[PDB]
Amino acid sequence: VRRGHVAPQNTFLDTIIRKFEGQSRKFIIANARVENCAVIYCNDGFCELCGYSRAEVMQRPCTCDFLHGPRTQRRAAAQIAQALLGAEERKVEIAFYRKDGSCFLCLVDVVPVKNEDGAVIMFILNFEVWTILHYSPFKAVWDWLILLLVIYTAVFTPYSAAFLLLAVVDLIVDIMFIVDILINFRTTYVNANEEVVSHPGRIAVHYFKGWFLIDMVAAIPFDLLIGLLKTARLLRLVRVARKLDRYSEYGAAVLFLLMCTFALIAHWLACIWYAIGNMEQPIGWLHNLGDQIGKPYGGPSIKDKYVTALYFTFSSLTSVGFGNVSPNTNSEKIFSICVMLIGSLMYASIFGNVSAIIQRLYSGTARYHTQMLRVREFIRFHQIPNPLRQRLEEYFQHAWSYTNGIDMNAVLKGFPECLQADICLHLNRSLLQHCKPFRGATKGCLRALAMKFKTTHAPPGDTLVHAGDLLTALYFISRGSIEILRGDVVVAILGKNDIFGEPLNLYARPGKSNGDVRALTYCDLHKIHRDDLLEVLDMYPEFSDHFWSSLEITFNLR
Amino acid sequence: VRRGHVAPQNTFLDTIIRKFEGQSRKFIIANARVENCAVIYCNDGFCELCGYSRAEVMQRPCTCDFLHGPRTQRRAAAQIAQALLGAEERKVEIAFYRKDGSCFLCLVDVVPVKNEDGAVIMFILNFEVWTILHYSPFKAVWDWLILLLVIYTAVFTPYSAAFLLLAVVDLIVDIMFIVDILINFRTTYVNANEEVVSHPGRIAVHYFKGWFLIDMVAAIPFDLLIGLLKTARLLRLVRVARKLDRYSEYGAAVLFLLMCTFALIAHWLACIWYAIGNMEQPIGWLHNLGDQIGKPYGGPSIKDKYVTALYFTFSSLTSVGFGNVSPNTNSEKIFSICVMLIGSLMYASIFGNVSAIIQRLYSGTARYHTQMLRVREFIRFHQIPNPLRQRLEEYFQHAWSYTNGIDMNAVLKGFPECLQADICLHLNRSLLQHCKPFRGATKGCLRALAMKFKTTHAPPGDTLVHAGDLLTALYFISRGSIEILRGDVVVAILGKNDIFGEPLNLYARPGKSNGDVRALTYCDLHKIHRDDLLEVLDMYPEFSDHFWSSLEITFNLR
Amino acid sequence: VRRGHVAPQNTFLDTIIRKFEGQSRKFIIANARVENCAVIYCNDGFCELCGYSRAEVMQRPCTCDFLHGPRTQRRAAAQIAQALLGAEERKVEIAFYRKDGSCFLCLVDVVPVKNEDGAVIMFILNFEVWTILHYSPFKAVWDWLILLLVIYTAVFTPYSAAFLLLAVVDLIVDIMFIVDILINFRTTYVNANEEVVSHPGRIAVHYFKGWFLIDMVAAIPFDLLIGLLKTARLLRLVRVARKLDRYSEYGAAVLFLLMCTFALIAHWLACIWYAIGNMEQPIGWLHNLGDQIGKPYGGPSIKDKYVTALYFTFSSLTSVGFGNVSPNTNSEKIFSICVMLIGSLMYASIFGNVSAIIQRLYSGTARYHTQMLRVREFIRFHQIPNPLRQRLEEYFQHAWSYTNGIDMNAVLKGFPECLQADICLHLNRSLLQHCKPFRGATKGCLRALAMKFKTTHAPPGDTLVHAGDLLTALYFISRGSIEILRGDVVVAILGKNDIFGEPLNLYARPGKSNGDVRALTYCDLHKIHRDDLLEVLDMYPEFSDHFWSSLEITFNLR
C-alpha cells in the first residue's frame, strides 16, 4: 500500500499563513537562526502598504531601515530589535514610511512561535492601523488472517442456514469482527494530501462516512425461530473489497483469490439449489435423487444432498452438463438458465484473467523464448559461424539472466533528474565514495557525474578494447580482475578500485591503445566518456585542477 | 457523435466563385471595409485578358490605374469609384488597356452582395466584350429511450406470434415508431463536407435514399386471421444498427448491449424451437416433455413450454448440453446442429469481446500491475535501500494516480503546432494571463513560449534543485508554498505567482545556487529552459527589452 | 542449453592472489616472457610498505632500483636477478628503502610457477620482516531417449497397479534408470561462475545436494503381496522437470509435450476413477456399466473397464459431459467435482499456451498479413498507380522473404560495440578481406569501418542512383552484375569485387552523376557514406595516404 511519508518540519508556518490569509491581517515572517532575521516570507497585504514588492523586500533584515524615516523615534524603534531577542509579546505604538514617503498610523505585534523543543524559531510580525501503524509487520500478516476467517463466514453460514432447519468454533470467529472496528480507529490511514494522521481525534469521522454503516451491521450478534437473519455475516466480504489493493501485491496469490471465489460462487448456488427443492412440495429433482441413491420417501442423507447440489452447480457453470442431476420443474429451469448466463460470463471472465496471470507469473519464460527466436533468426539470416555464434548466445543468455529482461535505462528515465541522480549515486557508490579524487568533491558535482556514468558489466573472456582503437571512454574497476595483453604477452592485471585509459589533458584528443583488455571473473565495472567528462569540469572550474592532480590513472596507453 | 462545427462567415463568396467558374464569366472581388477596396480575389480569366498575374494584381486598389490609359475618359472612370460608394447596379461602357498597351471592347458590371444585416460588404466586378439539434440533451437521452422499446419489439412480438395461436401496452409503443420518422426530418445531420444542414428543405432527400424504405415498412399498422405479418416490427432493429457509434461512447454500456443480445439470440431460438414442435404432428420432444412434467395428452402449460425451450437453446449455444430436453426427430437435430454451429461462433466471438471489454473497462489496473513489477524488478536488480526505495515507490504511485498512466506529451504531439499551442496556452493560462510581464506581450509570442514550457508537478518533500547545481531552468509557482534552505536554515518561502532562479542576462552562463528548494503541499508549478528562452527573444526583439525590465525574479541565486 | 565456455589461460594467477590475499603475505608478480620482467600485478600490502602506489610501480623492471639504496649490497642484489634466470627457490637476506628513505628488515622469496608444458612463466616475489560432455551429439539425442521411457513409467505403472490386482519389457526400462545416475556423475555441468567442471572429484557433491535423494529413490527395485510400492517409478518425472529448458528449444516440440501430458492427466484420473469403483462395494457406476454392455454379476471386461474410465475422465475435463457414464454415489461426485475444478483450470491454461504456440510456430504468417494490410491501406490512402504499386508490392514481398520480417539493425544494437563490430566484420568479410586496399590495413580500423558499413540489398531492375543526384555514398559490389546507363545507352557493367562513385578527395564535396545504375540479378552489395569515411581517416592518419593510393575506383562520375 502507498504511504504519504511525512509533512515536512516547517509545515507549521504554512498553516499559520492560511489563518491570516483568510483573516487578511497583513504580516511578515523572519527566522531566528539565520544570523540577523532575514525576511523569509511576506504576503501581498504588507507589500501594497509600503509599496515595495517581494523582489525588493525578500532577504532584508528584520529592522527594515527602508520602512523608517524622520518621524519614527530612536527609543521606540530600538524596542523592536530587543523584543525579538528577549521573546515576548509587545504592542508597538510607532509610525512608518512608504516608498513615496508618507507617514501613517501603524501598530506592530511580535509573536514568537515556540516549537516542541523549547527555543524560539520564527517571528510573525502582524500590522494594523497508544497507536498502531497500518504498514506494520503486525498489521501486515493480520490483514491475511482476517481474510481467512471472512472465507469461513461466506462458506459456513449458508450451510448452517439452508440445510439444518461446531458450537465453540462459531463465537470465536463472531467476536473477532467486533474487535476489528476498534482496530480501524487506532490504526493509521493516508489521505492524498493528509500524509498519515496520528492521534485518535480525527480518523473517527473518516470511518463513519467511509465504512462504519456497512461494517457495523456485519458485527451485531442478536438473540431475540427465524435465525435466517445471520445473513448479515456475508457483509463482512466488504472488508476484503475495500482492501483489494493490499492483496494484489503478491501476483501468485491472485490465483488463490480467483480460484477460491470460483468455489464460493458454486457454493452459494449449491445452497440455493437445495433451497428450491424444499420450499415447493406438491416430482422434481429431489424425489428423482431418491431413486438414484436407493432412499425414497425416511429419505436420503444431508451430506449427499449438499454434494449432489454442488456437483450440479459446478457442472452447470463450468459448462459440462452431466445430467445425472438436472432440472425438471419451471423454477428449476429458471435457476439453470440463470446459472448458464452467469456461468457463461464467469467462465469467460474469471479464467480469462487466469490466462493473463499465468503469463504474468511466468513472464520471464514468455519474452525469453520470443527474444531467443530473434537471435536464431538473426543467425540463420547472416549465417554466423560457431566461434562468433557462441559469443552472441552467451552474451544474450548472460545479459538476460543478469537483468531478467528489464530495461534498466528506459525505466530510469521515466523518473526526473534529481531522483535519477539519486538512483545512479546509489549504483555508483562503490567508486564515488571510496576514491581519493571523488571524496574531495562537492555534492552538486557527484550527481552530475552519476548521470553521465554507465554501469557496463563484463563477463569472463570478453574484449572491451582492442589494439589501435580510439579510447573514447575511461574505466573504473569495481569487481574482479582485468588483464592487459599485447600479442599473447601479459602486461598487467588490475583488481578492484583501479583505473585505465588516458588522462584527458595530455594532448586533447583520443589516443590509441597498446593492446587487449580482458576479464577473468565476472569483472563488473563502470564507464564514462571523454565527451561527457569535458562538460562537467567546464561547469565546475573549482573541481578540475584538483581532480587531475589527486587522481592517478594506473595505466597510460599508446 | 462527431460534429461539422460551422461553415465560416465568408463562405458565401466561395459559392459565388463556383457559379461564375462554371459560367466562365471573368470577374474580380474587393471588400468594402478594408480602406480603399483591395483586390481580395481574382480568377485566371481576368488575369489573361490584361496580362498581369495574381502576384501583381492582388492587393491593388479597386480603381486600377494600371488598367486605364489615354483612350479611357475622366467622366466615365469616375462613375466606377462613385458606384461602389453609392451601392447600385451599373453597366459601364468603357475601354481598358492590357500590359502591352492595346485598347479593346469591355463592359463592367458592379453587383453589391448585401448580407443578412443590411450594409454592403463585397463587390463582384464582372467583365465582358421550428428545428431540433441532433447533439442536444433532449435528443441525447431520447436515443436511449428508443433503444429500450426496440428491445420490447424484438422480445414480445415472437412470444405473441408463435405461442398464442397487455392490450393497452402494445399500441403506445407502436405509435411511437410513427413519430420517429417525423423526428428524423426536423433533427439535423452532418455530411463530411456539409457541416450541419438546418431548414427542412434538404434533409428530406437524404432520409429517402438513406433509410426511409426500411424504417417506413417497420412503422405500418394494418388490420385487414394470419397476424404473422407483425414480423415487420423486427426491422426496427435497424434504428439501432445505423446509430451504433452513438452507444459505444459509454464503454461499460457495451457489456449491457452484448449481454442483452445474447438473451435475444436465445429468445428467438427458443420461440423457433417451440414452433418446430407444433407444425409437424404425427413421439418427439413435446410429447416427451408431457411425461417429465406429469401432463400428457389436456396438455402441459404454455409458460412451461416457453421456459423449457429457452432452457434448451441456452444449454445448446452456451455449450453445456443438459439433456433433460434434447432432439429426437430429424428436424429437431437439424435445429440443434444449426444452434451448435452459430453457438460455437457466438460463444467465441461475443465473449471474446467481453474479455477485451473487461480489460478495457479496468485498463488502469491492467497496466498498473505490469508497471509496478518493473519498479520491483528494478529494485531487486540494483538492490535499493529503503530511504531511496520509498521515493521511487511514492513518485510512481503519485505520478500514476495524478495522470492515470496517460502519456500527456506523446498524445499532445499527435496534433499540429497551432492546436498544440492552444493546448499549452490552456494549461499555462495561470501564468501567461496573470503576470505583469506576460500581459504586456504580443499573441504570437505567447503561443511560442507555451510550446517550450513544461508542466512539472512537485509533490511534498521533493528536492527540485540542490546546492552548487547549474541552473539551466527558470521556474514559476502556480500552486502551494515552496521553501528555500541552505544547511537546515530556512531562507524564504514562496507562495503562488512567484519566480526563482536567475536573470538570463547578468553574466550569460548557468550560475550556481545557494541551496535546496523543497515543496510543502502539492506545490504544482511550471518550468522552461534558458536555452529555450534565448531562442524566443532573438525572434522577438520588441518583446525582450520589456520582459526583463517589467519582470522581477523574487530570488537571485549564487 | 547455455555454456560457460572456458576459464582463460591466466586464471591460475587469479587463484594464487586469493590465497595470499587471505593470508595477507604481501607480494608482487612479473612475467618471464615480456623482455625484462615488468611488474604485471601488485597488492596494496607491498605498496604501503615502500610508499609508491600502483600508478608508479606498474610497468617497472623486476630489479627495482627505486627500492635499493646505499645499505643494500652489490653481491646480494645480483643474486635476485640471477635467481629469476635460473629458476629456483631462494631466501634472500637483504634490506630495502622506502619513498622517504628509511632502511628496514626484509626477506625475499622467489617461487617460479611452472605450467603444464614445462617452462617458467610467472614469478611471485613474497616479502616479510574417462569423461563425457553435456552438449554432445551423444548426450543430445540421449536426453530425448530418456524422456520417451519416462512416458512409459507414467502410463504403464498405473495400469499395472490399479487393474491387475510384458515380462521382459519391464526390467529393460527399470535397469536404465540405475545407469542414469552413473551418467550424471561423468557428464559435465555449468555453474554461473564455474564455467564447466571436468574431472570426477567435484560434481559428486553437486549431485547429492542437487537431485540425488529424489532420483535415487526412483531407481530402487526391491522384491521383499503389496506391490503398490512401485509408485516410486513416478518420481522419474523429476528428470524431465529439472531439464525443462533443454526441450523448449524446439518450439514445435512443445505441442507434443503439452498434448501428451493432457493424455496422462486423463490417464491417471481414468485409473483413479476405476479404483473408486472397487474399494467400496455394498448400485454405483460399475454395476450400472454391467447393464449397458450386457455383462452383469461373471462380469464385464477389463479392457472395457479402462476405456469407459478414460472416456469418462476425458468427457469431464474437456468439459463435454456425455452421461453414458456418470457419477451417482457421494465419492463418485466428489471425484467429478475435483475433475471439473482441475479441468476448468487445465482446459483454460494448457490450451491457452497452445493458442500462443500456434501463433509462435506460424509467427511469419501472423505479422505478414498485418504488415500487408498497411501497404494496401497506404495504397488506398494516396491512390497509387499500378507501375508504382508493383514496386512497393515487390520490394515488400522481397524484403520480407529475404529477412523473414527480422529487425537486423535493431537486434544488432542490443549487443555492445566489440561484439557489434564482430557481427559486421563477419557480414562484410567478402570486401574487407579480399581487397588490395583493405588487406593492407590495421585491425582496429577494420572494426571501425564495419560499424559504419551498410548491407544494402538490391533486387533486379531497381534504380540505386539517378542522373544529377548528389553522391553521398560509396558502393562495393559483392554479388551479381550492375549496369550503368545514361539515356538508354549502356556505358558499362560491373561484376563482383567492383567499386563506383567518386574519390573523396578530388574537390571535397558531393559531385553529381552521369546517369542510372541498375541491377540484373540479385546484385547484393554494401554501402557507406562520405560523412562516415571522413571520420575514420581523421582518426587514422597512417591508414589514409595508403587507402587512396592503392584503391582505384572503377567508375568516376560527373
Swiss-Prot record, chains A, B, C:
Outcome when changing W285C: In LQT2; uncertain significance
Q: What is the effect of changing G444V?
A: In LQT2; uncertain significance
- Mind giving the lineage of the organism this protein is from? Eukaryota, Metazoa, Chordata, Craniata, Vertebrata
Q: Which portion of the complete protein is shown here?
A: 3 to 863 of 1159
Q: What is the effect of changing D180Y?
A: In LQT2; uncertain significance
The UniProt-reported impact of N324I is: In LQT2; uncertain significance
Outcome of swapping C271S: In LQT2; uncertain significance
Question: How is the protein modified post-translationally, according to the record?
Answer: Phosphorylated on serine and threonine residues. Phosphorylation by PKA inhibits ion conduction.
Tell me what effect the entry lists for C62W: In LQT2; uncertain significance
Q: What is the effect of changing R479W?
A: Predisposes to LQT2 and torsades de pointes while taking the drug amiodarone; in vitro studies confirmed a significant reduction in potassium currents; the ECG abnormalities reversed on drug withdrawal
Reported effect of changing G284R? In LQT2; uncertain significance
Give the protein name, as stated in the record: Voltage-gated inwardly rectifying potassium channel KCNH2
Q: What is known of its domains?
A: The S4-S5 linker acts as a signal integrator where it both couples voltage-sensor domain (VSD) movement to pore opening and closure, as well as providing a binding site for other domains that regulate activation and/or deactivation of the channel.
The effect annotated for T63P is: In LQT2; decreased protein stability
Q: Induction of this protein: by what?
A: Up-regulated by RNF207 (at protein level).
Result for mutant: G343S: In LQT2; uncertain significance
